[PDB]
Design a protein around this nucleic acid. Structure first.
Lengths: 106, 156, 175, 84
RNA sequence: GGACCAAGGAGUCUAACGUCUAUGCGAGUGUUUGGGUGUAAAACCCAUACGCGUAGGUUGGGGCCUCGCAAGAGGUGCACAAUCGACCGAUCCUGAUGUCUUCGGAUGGAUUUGAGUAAGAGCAUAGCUGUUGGGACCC
RNA sequence: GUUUGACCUCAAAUCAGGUAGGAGUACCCGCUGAAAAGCGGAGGAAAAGAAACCAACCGGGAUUGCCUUAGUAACGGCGAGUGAAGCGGCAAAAGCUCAAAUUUGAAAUCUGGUACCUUCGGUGCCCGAGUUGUAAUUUGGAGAGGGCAACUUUGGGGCCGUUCCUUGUCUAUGUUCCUUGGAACAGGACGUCAUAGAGGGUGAGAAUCCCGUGUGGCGAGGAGUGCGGUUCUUUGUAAAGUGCCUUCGAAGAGUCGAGUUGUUUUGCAGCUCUAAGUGGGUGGUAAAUUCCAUCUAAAGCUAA
């Protein structure tokens, strides 16, 4: 037996985390740059979704290295495979738009 | 307050090691850039304050509803009835070139290049197959790169 | 699934298995002498259908027991019965008869040539593999979700297209 | 929704065997000699044929395709030793 | 079953189905896992999902209309009921046009069938209650 | 050479330096186990955790936790009832390190002692450890050697702020008249403050009596690299990254697996047997002498 009495409280604490982390990460977003990825499982195969990370080859197609891209806040998954054209292209456009909107301090 | 420890610590002459924290955990300093530390407000939120900056706070797709906060009046559809600033400051700062230093050359190896420059002159196929003063057997073009850097540094 | 086949020869049959019952429960409640000569009970024609006739033949060759069986000096009244119900062979085991054995509901799938590879010669279309049943379940669920999403779209349309305009004679119409 | 061909990632284990590792394994083979059931197994080939040899080897092993490779390997040993 | 007296002292809570009633919306309904917000365990706003549901005739007959001063007469007929239908699914025969020699179901029958079609009613919350289980009125 | 010495092993040290135990034990992790108890081991969390994964799709992508899946699948004298998981939505997000081929043009590595120094350390010197392998480089997402073309990059301190902690101090307005009362903090009349009318005390219900409360301010002592300025230096043929070309291009065995026994509801354990390298694991698939999918086990760490 357990009752979530702290449901109101923990959220507050969580936003405190979402405050406090943000304090350290002051210009940058809290979250990384995640891929837009179409789901499996025919019930959901029309659904698109947030994915974990893009790939090496896609980040190369964006025009940078993944080792550098992790410093730019772009989530990268090696074990994913890009197999759909439109997914790949839309995520490349996403990467380009993310590159357009950042300004990086030396 | 019914453990033996808590009751003894209550009855003790030591007094509780009491520290107050709950007020100061809500407020945070941003610690990182003095520009954001200037424009930070401590009143709006992380979210509202990043929006008032112009920086995208969360990347993508917030769960829940944002504040559309009544900027405009929305009127009913008749259905055809019958008859930036701080962004600019940080953009200048990232656009500001840092005072950089040219990577120079070390005195021994530029002297080595100076020996090669007088021994062979400028040609590279002779100095590539030189035993004395090319004992590390430098690459054909690394020789060119170091000599061009040395010439731009000294001796045209 | 099982195969039973003559390993230098053309026969090869694939049967599906349903509804097993074991020796553990009281459905048997008796043991017999392991090695007695079996009797069969072909509770079906097994004659008019040539492939069922081959099934009956190969079950005779398979389940026929030569006298090299140990403990065959006793006959333990051992009998096994085969019964095509619709196209499923119910197989039972008796020892007056008491069910002393495991229980089958068995299903033909396909017949092919050779010893394990040779070309497919016969197949009953009446069998459905249960993977296809699960696939039907998932496809029907995906169709339901598609219809539910389209209906939610049309509900938001009808909510947008549900608004009735004000009368020209109302206070909000004036002001 | 039309196509895109990924570059197929094959593990380096699945590539091939090197000259180095074949040399290593074969050089271990003559040094290690035979285990005693292998000493039995070469004799059992020579006496009662590869049928009974494969059956005894599968009994020593767990599976059958390993017994194939074991019998074939001892045939390679007999071919390497007796003719040469 | 009892010397007396004071105080304490025995159908509570929860979960799952069920009826009824009230309330909101309605073929839809359900904010509160979570996010945003805040005067801060309150209130306020809500993205994507998810849950459950949705996807003919005759006889009457509430009324209503007409006429009738009225009594009554005529007409249209809510809900619902009965009949005769129809159709779908099943049922057991017919077994065509075709037919790979065993495939096929065309047509016509037959009874019942079914919270069947023949123009929805549900979802959510609360209350009171029924059954079951948690120690389950107490000893 | 009956001598002497390398080792190697094993002892001894009131030799030097360290460390283990016990308590507590809500949460965690192992072992044992009835009709829980017990044992062992930790921490502020622990565990788990970067696929020998899930799937069959238009594929997904470490672990963890919540809602849903769902009281479903499945199991069960299919009786009692037992009872999942994929996907989806969310919270949170983070990835890395070994072991395989030579640095052979120089073991480049480290403990310890000592002398100094700016001391959670640094430098020097000397014993040792170590080739039966300590460093650099490389963990498949490859990588390495070169070569070409370019570009692109540099590290270490200080100090002062800032940030964090622990404190210290300052920061409003009636004690105005009357009645009652032992005592006004009660009642009436007239007021003032307020970003302060929370709370408490003061001889009865006190915003205004006191402490506070509220708003801000000034300190003090630490922690610290989080960043922000200054300031001092840092190169030595030093280190790295990207594209192209050329030449190569090595990985977890008493393990996998098999049988049996116990145990659990398929793993685990014991006993016996015991592999492969275009290998192996796992799952669908068949118009069938099938094709295709998907990972790399038997080494390790990792916040939330």
């Amino acid at each position: 037996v357990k009752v979530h009495f702290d449901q109101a409280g923990k959220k507050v604490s969580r936003r405190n985390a979402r405050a406090t982390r943000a304090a350290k990460i002051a210009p940058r977003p809290l979250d990384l740059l995640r891929p837009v990825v179409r789901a499996p499982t025919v019930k959901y195969n029309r659904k698109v979704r947030a994915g974990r990370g893009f790939t090496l080859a896609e980040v190369k197609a964006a025009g940078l290295t993944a080792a550098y891209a992790r410093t730019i806040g772009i989530a990268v998954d090696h074990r994913r495979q890009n197999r759909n054209q439109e997914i790949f292209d839309a995520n490349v456009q996403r990467l380009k738009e993310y590159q357009s909107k950042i300004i990086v301090f030396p | 307050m019914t453990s033996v420890r808590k009751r003894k610590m209550n009855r003790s002459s030591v007094g509780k090691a009491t520290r107050r924290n709950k007020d100061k955990q809500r407020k945070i300093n941003i610690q990182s850039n003095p520009i954001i530390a200037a424009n930070w407000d401590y009143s709006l939120t992380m979210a509202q304050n990043y929006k008032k900056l112009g920086l995208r706070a969360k990347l993508q797709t917030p769960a829940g509803g944002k504040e559309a906060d009544l900027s405009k009046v929305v009127k009913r559809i008749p259905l055809t009835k019958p008859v930036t600033e701080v962004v600019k400051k940080l953009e200048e700062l990232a656009s500001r070139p840092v005072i950089r230093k040219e990577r120079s050359q070390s005195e021994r190896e530029e002297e080595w290049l100076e020996k090669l420059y007088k021994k062979h002159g400028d040609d590279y196929k002779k100095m590539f197959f030189d035993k004395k003063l090319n004992i590390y057997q430098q690459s054909e073009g690394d020789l060119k790169r170091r000599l061009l850097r040395w010439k731009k540094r000294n001796g045209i | 699934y099982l195969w039973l086949s003559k390993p230098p020869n053309g026969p090869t049959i694939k049967f599906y298995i349903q509804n097993l019952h074991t020796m553990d429960e009281x459905x048997x409640x008796x043991x017999x002498x392991x090695g007695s000569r079996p009797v069969l009970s072909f509770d079906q024609r097994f004659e008019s259908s040539p492939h069922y006739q081959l099934i009956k033949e190969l079950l005779v060759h398979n389940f026929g027991v030569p006298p090299x069986x140990x403990x065959x000096x006793x006959x333990x009244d051992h009998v096994m019965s085969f019964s095509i119900v619709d196209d499923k062979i119910w197989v039972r085991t008796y020892e007056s008869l008491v069910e002393i054995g495991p229980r089958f509901v068995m299903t033909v799938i396909l017949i092919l040539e050779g010893s394990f590879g040779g070309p497919k010669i016969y197949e009953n279309k009446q069998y459905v593999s249960p993977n296809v049943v699960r696939a039907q379940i998932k496809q029907q669920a995906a169709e339901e979700a598609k219809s539910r999403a389209e209906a939610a779209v049309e509900r938001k349309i009808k909510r947008r297209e549900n608004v009735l305009a004000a009368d020209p004679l109302s206070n909000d119409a004036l002001f | 929704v039309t196509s895109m061909t990924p570059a197929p990632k094959i593990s380096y284990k699945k590539g091939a065997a090197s000259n180095r590792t074949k040399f290593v394994r074969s050089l271990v083979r003559e040094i290690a000699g035979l285990s005693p059931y292998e000493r039995r197994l070469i004799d059992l080939i020579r006496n009662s044929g590869e049928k009974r040899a494969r059956k005894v080897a599968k009994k020593r092993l767990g599976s059958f395709t390993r017994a194939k490779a074991k019998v074939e390997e001892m045939n390679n040993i007999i071919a390497a030793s007796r003719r040469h």
